[PDB]
Amino acid sequence: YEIQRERIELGRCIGEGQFGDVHQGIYMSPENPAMAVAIKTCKNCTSDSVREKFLQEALTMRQFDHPHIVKLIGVITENPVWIIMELCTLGELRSFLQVRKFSLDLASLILYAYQLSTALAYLESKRFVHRDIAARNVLVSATDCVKLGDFGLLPIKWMAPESINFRRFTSASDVWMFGVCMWEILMHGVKPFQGVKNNDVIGRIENGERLPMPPNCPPTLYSLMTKCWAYDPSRRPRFTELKAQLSTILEEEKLQ
């Protein structure tokens, strides 16, 4: 996975992760060429300690291969250390949904939910627990394609009650988080529990309260969300079940 630095043309800064800035760029391999890529940079990889955990995040992504998860292209392991990722040209999902609120059809929103469910069913089949499903971690590759962002790049308001209370994390706790992510998508990138203190979230959940039906959301889809938010994790659908139900909701919408 090692790439020669001279095969990367560093371009405009697009975002920023924990370790440092993220740039867009061009990767020239004798196989494409001129491939658009994202370049993750690291502040102070002069420090050898932060380089090891920075590069460990690339290894994380190496194990996955799915159309709706961003792909690792390679790494440049000498200073400055770079991780080369697939570029999702349209950027962060939340911003995308906010700017395009009155331009995106419902069919598109449901499509994004469905695509994410395929990625998450894949992760569930790999026995991989994500722990951080939220619209903030989704990228837009095309107007008809979203992808789970880099897993390297507490979220109480997204978390299942058993995660908040007892730090239990399972694929069923991921399902709860995905329910919240679906709500965010159908709300056009509004965050859940606005104006609510983190410490107050579990009290609301335990009171039976739930995020309300988004304006214009099909009741079948809202019903699906509420199934993700069963208090008892064993009562929540698996991601493969969500995928199947989202397929039908999408097909019905495409129809009207």
Ligand SMILES: COc1cc(N2CCN(C)CC2)ccc1/N=C1/N=CC(Cl)C(Nc2cccc3c2C(=O)N(C)C3)=N1
């Ligand atoms: C032009 O492509 C873009 C553009 C942006 N922005 C454009 C300029 N905005 C002012 C800020 C954000 C943000 C992201 C982006 N595309 C990618 N494509 C791939 C990857 Cl890995 C990536 N990385 C992120 C870049 C920024 C935020 C996040 C990223 C991420 O992976 N997560 C989970 C959050 N971003």
